[PDB]
Design an enzyme around this catalytic site. Structure first.
Site, PDB file in Angstrom:
ATOM      1  NE  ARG A   1      18.962  -6.673   5.296  1.00 59.13           N
ATOM      2  CZ  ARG A   1      18.213  -6.455   5.670  1.00 59.13           C
ATOM      3  NH1 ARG A   1      16.897  -7.239   5.634  1.00 59.13           N
ATOM      4  NH2 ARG A   1      16.826  -5.366   6.172  1.00 59.13           N
TER       5      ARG A   1
ATOM      6  CE  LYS B   1      -2.583   5.985  11.565  1.00 62.97           C
ATOM      7  NZ  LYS B   1      -2.944   4.861  12.829  1.00 62.97           N
TER       8      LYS B   1
ATOM      9  N   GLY C   1      11.631   0.195   2.554  1.00 61.68           N
ATOM     10  CA  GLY C   1      11.417  -0.693   1.707  1.00 61.68           C
ATOM     11  C   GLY C   1      10.877  -0.729   0.572  1.00 61.68           C
TER      12      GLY C   1
ATOM     13  N   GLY D   1      14.738   1.141   9.455  1.00 59.09           N
ATOM     14  CA  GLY D   1      14.589   1.196  10.849  1.00 59.09           C
ATOM     15  C   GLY D   1      16.379   1.689  11.065  1.00 59.09           C
TER      16      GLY D   1
END
Length: 386
Positions: free
Chosen positions: A35, A192, A340, A363
Site C-alpha cells: 500500500r 456463501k 485477499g 471491500g
C-alpha cells in the site's frame, strides 16, 4: 468525472492527501508495504508540483477519541523517512493548525483516532478542510466509506480532486466492467452465495463465463442436483443460483479433490462430481476441471479474478488454483484481480507481473463490482459539476 491532482497547479499550495497506508505492523515496524509503495508516486508528484504536503490515512479500526499505540501511524512515518531520504514527521496534533512549508511533507497521526471520523462529522470534516487549499482523495480501498477524511473533507475543501492512484483504479475497473473486451470471464469464490449475491448478480449481467469456487460452487453444484457431501451450501439459495446460471454460463466442475478430514491418516482423492460421498469435503477442483477452466481463461479477452478454487495453502488442494493462476498469467486477456485470498494466491504462485491490474482494496473493489455508488467518488463528482 472528477478533478485530477495531476491537472492542478499546486505550487505553494497546501495539499491534504488521503492515502491508503493501512499496512501490517508488528512491534512498531511495518512488515509489508504494498500500500505504501503504491502511494509513493502520488506523494512524490505532489512534492514535485511544489506542494506543501500533508498525508493522512487510517490504520486498523481503533477506538475513536483514544490514543492506541498499536494503531499509531508512527511506523509509517519511520518508513516514509527512509523511503524519501528525509525526515517525515508524524504530526500528532493537527486539527488546530499545522506548520508545513512548500516542498515539505508530514504524516498525520491515524485519522481514525479522531472523534467523528467514522460517522463523517461536519465539525471534523471542516477542520480537515481548513488545513489545506486542495484535498486529494487517493485511497480507493476506503472509497466505499463516507468518513471524515474520505468524504466529509471533500464537501468543504476549497478544491477537491482525485489522486493518480484513485484515478488509475477507477480506469482499470471501468475497463473490465464498463464494456469489456469479449469474451469476459469472472472467477468468484467464497463461502456463501448469500454473502456475495450482489457481486454474482452484477457480474451475471456483465461477464460471459462465471467460474464459481468454494462454498459458492457447492451451492451451484447442489442446485444442479450434484452431490456435495460434507461441504457448506445454502439450500435456500438454490433457486437463486439456478436463476444466475440461467443469466450467464456457469461451468460446473466435472471432477473435484476431496478429503474426509484433515488428519495424517486421510488421503486427498480426485473423484468425478457424481461420486462425491456424503462424508467427503470438496476442497479443490479436479485436474480435468482445471484443464477445462484454463482453456476458457486463455480464450478470454477480459478476466476478473475474485477467488481461489481450492484450499490452496494445502498443496494437495492447490492444483486447481495453481493451474488457474498460471492460465491467467499466460492469457492474452486484460486481467484484474481483487480480494485477499486472490492476492495471496497471486503471491504464492508468482504471477503478479502477469496480472494487468491488482486491486489492493477488497471491500471497495467488491462494491465497485456490485455496481454500488462509492461515496468518496460521488462527493468528488458533485464538487466538479457545481
Amino acid at each position: 468525472t472528477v478533478l485530477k491532482m495531476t491537472d492542478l497547479d499546486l505550487q505553494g499550495k497546501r495539499v491534504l492527501i488521503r492515502e491508503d497506508l493501512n499496512v501490517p505492523v508488528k512491534d512498531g515496524v511495518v512488515t509489508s508495504d504494498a500500500r505504501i509503495l503504491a502511494s509513493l508516486p502520488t506523494i512524490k508528484l505532489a512534492l514535485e508540483k511544489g506542494a506543501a504536503v500533508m498525508v493522512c490515512s487510517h490504520l486498523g479500526r481503533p477506538t475513536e477519541g483514544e490514543f492506541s499505540a498499536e494503531n499509531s501511524l508512527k511506523p509509517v512515518a519511520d518508513y516514509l523517512s527512509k523511503a524519501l531520504g528525509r525526515e517525515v514527521p508524524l504530526v500528532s496534533d493537527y486539527l488546530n493548525g499545522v506548520d508545513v512549508k512548500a516542498g515539505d511533507i508530514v504524516l498525520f497521526e491515524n485519522v481514525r483516532f479522531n472523534k467523528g471520523e467514522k460517522k463523517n462529522a461536519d465539525e471534523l470534516a471542516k477542520q480537515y478542510a481548513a488545513l489545506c487549499d486542495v484535498f486529494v482523495m487517493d485511497a480507493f480501498g476506503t472509497a466505499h466509506r463516507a468518513e471524515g477524511s474520505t468524504h466529509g473533507v471533500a464537501k468543504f475543501a476549497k478544491v477537491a480532486a482525485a489522486g493518480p492512484l484513485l484515478a488509475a483504479e477507477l480506469d482499470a475497473l471501468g475497463k473490465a466492467l464498463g464494456a469489456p473486451a469479449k469474451p469476459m470471464a469472472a472467477i468468484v469464490a467464497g463461502s456463501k452465495v448469500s454473502t456475495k449475491l450482489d457481486v454474482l448478480n452484477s457480474l451475471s449481467q456483465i461477464c460471459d463465463l462465471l467460474i464459481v469456487g468454494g462454498g459458492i460452487a457447492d451451492t451451484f453444484l447442489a442446485a444442479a442436483g450434484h452431490p456435495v457431501g460434507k461441504s457448506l451450501y445454502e439450500p435456500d439459495l438454490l433457486d437463486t443460483a439456478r436463476a444466475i446460471a440461467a443469466k450467464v454460463n456457469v461451468p460446473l466442475p466435472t471432477d473435484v479433490v476431496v478429503a474426509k478430514e484433515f488428519a495424517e491418516s486421510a488421503e486427498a482423492t480426485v473423484k468425478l462430481i457424481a461420486d462425491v460421498a456424503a462424508d467427503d469435503m470438496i476442497l479443490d477442483i479436479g485436474p480435468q476441471t482445471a484443464e477445462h477452466f484454463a482453456q476458457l481463461l486463455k480464450t478470454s479477452k477480459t478476466i476478473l479474478w475474485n477467488g481461489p478454487v481450492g484450499v490452496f495453502e494445502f498443496d494437495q488442494f492447490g492444483n486447481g488454483t495453481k493451474v488457474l493462476a498460471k492460465a491467467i498469467a499466460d492469457s492474452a486477456a486484460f486481467s484484474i484481480a481483487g480480494g485477499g485470498d486472490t492476492l495471496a494466491a497471486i503471491d504464492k504462485y508468482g504471477v503478479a507481473d502477469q496480472i494487468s491490474q491488482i486491486s489492493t482494496g477488497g471491500g471497495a473493489f467488491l462494491e465497485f463490482v456490485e455496481g454500488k455508488v462509492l461515496p468518496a467518488v460521488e462527493v468528488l463528482e458533485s464538487r466538479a459539476k457545481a
